[PDB]
Ligand SMILES: *Cc1cc2c(cc1C)nc1c(=O)[nH]c(=O)nc-1n2C[C@H](O)[C@H](O)[C@H](O)COP(=O)(O)OP(=O)(O)OC[C@H]1O[C@@H](n2cnc3c(N)ncnc32)[C@H](O)[C@@H]1O
Ligand code: PRO
Ligand code: PRO
């Protein structure tokens with residue numbers, strides 16, 4: 577028996593477990609694998625954190641809280657957590673809602689940003705070649721998280737404080753009562769007062785076992801690392817992280833760290849998949865490499881060398897691409913964290929705090945109604 581069980585000890589679940597353990601709550605975390613791992617949504621080494629938020633100005637306080645928590649984690653562990661690369665956002669002037677909302681978000685929250693146009697972009701960051709009609713907003717104080725190290729650090733800190741992590745154990749079913757929760761696995765059954773459910777892409781398959789019917793679609797999302805001109809694209813010469821809008825969608829990427837090569841993903845396209853049958857080999861579809869080189873040859877031509885490494889990862893999308901962070905509508909002793917829609921990792925520190933509050937008290941300090949499980953746009 578525990579105070580709290582966390583099912584899925586990944587990005588959100590491990591952060592929640594640390595928050596609980598820190599408060600002396602007796603916590604069990606259960607995971608299908610041994611986090612961090614390459615079967616979920618957290619691998620590929622690096623994750624962008626932005627504060628000025630093109631998906632919506634209402635995420636900014638959560639972003640800023642999460643950033644402060646990431647600096648706190650850096651101080652507590654020997655693992656590397658965060659590098660302040662800055663984040664460049666650009667797109668054609670007048671033709672990117674994402675860029676426009678990034679700019680509005682920065683204004684509304686008085687964030688520190690630089691605004692640039694056309695050739696100014698290419699001049700400031702050798703290696704970038706945008707058309708003259710593009711504009712940009714650069715956020716100097718955001719950057720890059722080392723996501724596998726984040727999970728490892730939270731795990732080690734939680735375990736030192738008495739959290740138990742049961743690895744390689746799939747939760748197969750749930751039994752919820754008014755006064756207790758139970759999970760069923762092939763390695764045994766466990767009970768607690770409260771449950772947090774954070775199974776990433778598997779939320780789309782297993783939330784039905786809690787009598788929930790929520791549209792959730794897992795997507796197969798690849799990234800690649802490319803041999804690059806290190807005099808232009810290295811973190812050592814202040815090449816930024818980036819998230820940009822071009823006519824054919826949104827691309828994102830990372831400077832080369834220690835010669836790993838520039839890393840690139842295509843955000844707005846992926847294959848609809850089931851997490852149990854996804855093909856986790858990079859390059860099995862022509863789109864995997866070709867969509868990436870299409871961007872590199874046009875906008876970052878010195879980073880379009882040999883493919884050094886590929887990875888395959890999953891998003892879990894809601895209809896509105898906003899998260900789900902709430903109590904179960906029928907069971908106040910069950911907390912749901914789902915649907916992070918390809919943009920949740922940067923918030924995992926702050927979400928851990930929210931989940932711990934919801935589990936312990938049934939409430940949170942600030943409104944999180946944008947992530948309500950009851951909202952119309954979910955259905
Ligand atoms: C895939 C991806 C995502 C991504 C990104 C690039 C790629 C290629 N870039 C990002 C970026 O730069 N910045 C950012 O803020 N987010 C970015 N993302 C998205 C982000 O990585 C995800 O939103 C986030 O990782 C989601 O976290 P969540 O905690 O929901 O998912 P998870 O880490 O995969 O953890 C789920 C765990 O649950 C376990 N599991 C699943 N089923 C079970 C059962 N039945 N029993 C027990 N455990 C279970 C999994 O094993 C996993 O550990
Ligand atoms: O495919 C998609 O993105 C949406 C998300 C939930 C269900 N369908
Ligand atoms: O959430 C982010 O910042 C990155 C860029 C789009 C995909 N994930």
Ligand SMILES: [Cl-]
Nearest residue numbers: 891892917918
């Ligand atoms: Cl996701």
